[PDB]
Amino acid sequence: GSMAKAAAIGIDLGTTYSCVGVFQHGKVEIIANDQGNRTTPSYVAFTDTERLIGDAAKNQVALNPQNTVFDAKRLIGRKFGDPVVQSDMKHWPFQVINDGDKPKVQVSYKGETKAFYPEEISSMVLTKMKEIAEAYLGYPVTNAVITVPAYFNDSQRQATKDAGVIAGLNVLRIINEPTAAAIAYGLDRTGKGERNVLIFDLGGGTFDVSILTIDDGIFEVKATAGDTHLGGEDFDNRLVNHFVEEFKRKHKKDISQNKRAVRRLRTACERAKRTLSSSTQASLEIDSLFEGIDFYTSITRARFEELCSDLFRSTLEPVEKALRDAKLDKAQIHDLVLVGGSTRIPKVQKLLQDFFNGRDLNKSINPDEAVAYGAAVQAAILIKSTRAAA
């Protein structure tokens, strides 16, 4: 009669990390990759012999910075001359070239110089997310919902669809990341009446605040605000500068000019930063950090909080601006939703909860997974083809 249909997938195609989910048996499964990771770096690396995607690409970045591409989402659907592109290029070790006022990333790959459009790099990330899903499902996957930032324009949305098509995916729909996070919590399933929802999205490098109004399952974007210069990497930087000073005080040595030492310090700082979200202190233990000196120390959550205090407080400025733009008072927000791994920071949660006079924050769905979770919910809805009974 009619053969069983393959599940459709939800993909959060993130700037730094991507995430894939599938809605089956009335629930979402966020799918881990074959290294056991529930999120996959949005990285692609090129060598003389291989093209590596995800963890394999990010794990070899230190010695291959010129041919390991990341942040392609910052280039997608943009002109080479766009001022955002021109500023971002100064921070990237890989080459970005001008092809008819369209940016391309240029690398060494399999004995040749090759240039790729941002959508081609994103199609490589999408191919890995599709394979992660297929390894779990045990069959080929065709259909996907892909999410984008609410502020993406027509060109950025079309280039994201193009990336899905290059990857061999049928793109069911391009949906906004804040809308997907709201769908993850079933905030569009609460019946009749308007609900105002604030999505607080703190990423690795950027911070986005969105205000949505939901009425009978219909979403309207009321306001977007944020800070392009605020993210998890800035907190890592504060810890790096702190420990560089500490090594100077303790050993009378400046490590800041040995890239390996700085990198090993940053890697340990990011892990200590994660530990501090669950513990009140965290040890830092690096063997032979510089000149054969072992660096065995610790940091309290209170000291880390003081180090990033101004950065954490600055998340409330775009919240206030978004509320002015939406013409809403904080008491008029029905739901608060957390998105991004950096929202696990207890002090970030406390500042926002205090701002909203003690209100509960929806954080029960892993904040680095909520967007893919909502996209997976929508993908299953979009492939339904029920024929009405008489």
Measure the CA–CA gap between 119 and 166, rounded to whole angstroms. 8
The arrangement of strands across the sheet holding 335-339 comes to 218-227, 207-215, 194-202, 335-339
Q: Which is nearer to Mg ion, 129 or 265 (CB)?
A: 129
For 27, residues 6+ apart whose C-beta sits below 8 A from its C-beta are none
Residue 307 among known ligand-binding residues = no
Judge whether 73 counts as a catalytic residue. yes
Asked whether the beta carbons of 308 and 230 are under 8 A apart, the reply is no
List contacts with ligand GBA (CB under 6 A). 16-17, 203-204, 232-233, 270, 273-274, 277, 341-342, 344-345, 368
Which of these is catalytic: 58, 73, 222, 347?
73
Residue 24 C-alpha from the chain's centroid = 24
Q: Which residue is nearest to ligand GBA (CB)?
A: 232
Measure the CA–CA gap between 106 and 304, rounded to whole angstroms. 38
315's contact among Mg ion, ligand GBA, none, with CB below 5 to 8 A by partner kind, is: none
238's contact among ligand GBA, Mg ion, none, with CB below 5 to 8 A by partner kind, is: none
List contacts with Mg ion (CB under 5 A). 14
Q: Is 7 exposed, middle or buried (0-12, 13-18, 19+ CB in 10 A)?
A: buried
Q: Which is nearer to ligand GBA, 146 or 308 (CB)?
A: 308
Asked whether the beta carbons of 261 and 251 are under 8 A apart, the reply is no
Which candidate, 31, 126, 9, places its Cα nearest to that of 76?
126
Provide the minimum distance between the beta carbon of 238 and ligand GBA in the complex, in angstroms, as a whole number.
12
Measure the CA–CA gap between 204 and 18, rounded to whole angstroms. 12
Judge whether 177 counts as a catalytic residue. yes
Residue 191 among known ligand-binding residues = no
270's contact among ligand GBA, Mg ion, none, with CB below 5 to 8 A by partner kind, is: ligand GBA
Q: Which is nearer to ligand GBA, 305 or 325 (CB)?
A: 305
Residue 185 among known ligand-binding residues = no
Provide the minimum distance between the beta carbon of 330 and Mg ion in the complex, in angstroms, as a whole number.
24
Provide the minimum distance between the beta carbon of 383 and ligand GBA in the complex, in angstroms, as a whole number.
30
Residue 81 among known ligand-binding residues = no
Provide the minimum distance between the beta carbon of 4 and ligand GBA in the complex, in angstroms, as a whole number.
36
Provide the minimum distance between the beta carbon of 276 and ligand GBA in the complex, in angstroms, as a whole number.
7
Q: Which is nearer to ligand GBA, 86 or 364 (CB)?
A: 364
Provide the minimum distance between the beta carbon of 340 and ligand GBA in the complex, in angstroms, as a whole number.
6
134's contact among ligand GBA, Mg ion, none, with CB below 5 to 8 A by partner kind, is: none
Measure the CA–CA gap between 68 and 87, rounded to whole angstroms. 19
Residue 274 among known ligand-binding residues = yes
Which of these is catalytic: 55, 71, 188, 201?
201
208's contact among Mg ion, ligand GBA, none, with CB below 5 to 8 A by partner kind, is: none
**Angle, alpha carbons 151-157-159 (nearest 5°):** 135
**Per-residue DSSP letters for 48-91?**
SS-EEETHHHHTTTTT-GGGEE--GGGTTT--TT-HHHHHHGGG
Judge whether 12 counts as a catalytic residue. yes
Judge whether 201 counts as a catalytic residue. yes
Dihedral of CA atoms 310, 316, 322, 327 in degrees, nearest 10, equals: -130
Q: Which is nearer to ligand GBA, 231 or 326 (CB)?
A: 231
What's the start-to-end Cα distance of the chain, in Å?
21
Q: Is 188 exposed, middle or buried (0-12, 13-18, 19+ CB in 10 A)?
A: buried
Binding residues: 14-17, 73, 204-206, 270-277, 341-344
Residues assigned a catalytic role = 12, 73, 177, 201
Binding residues for ATP: 14-17, 73, 204-206, 270-277, 341-344
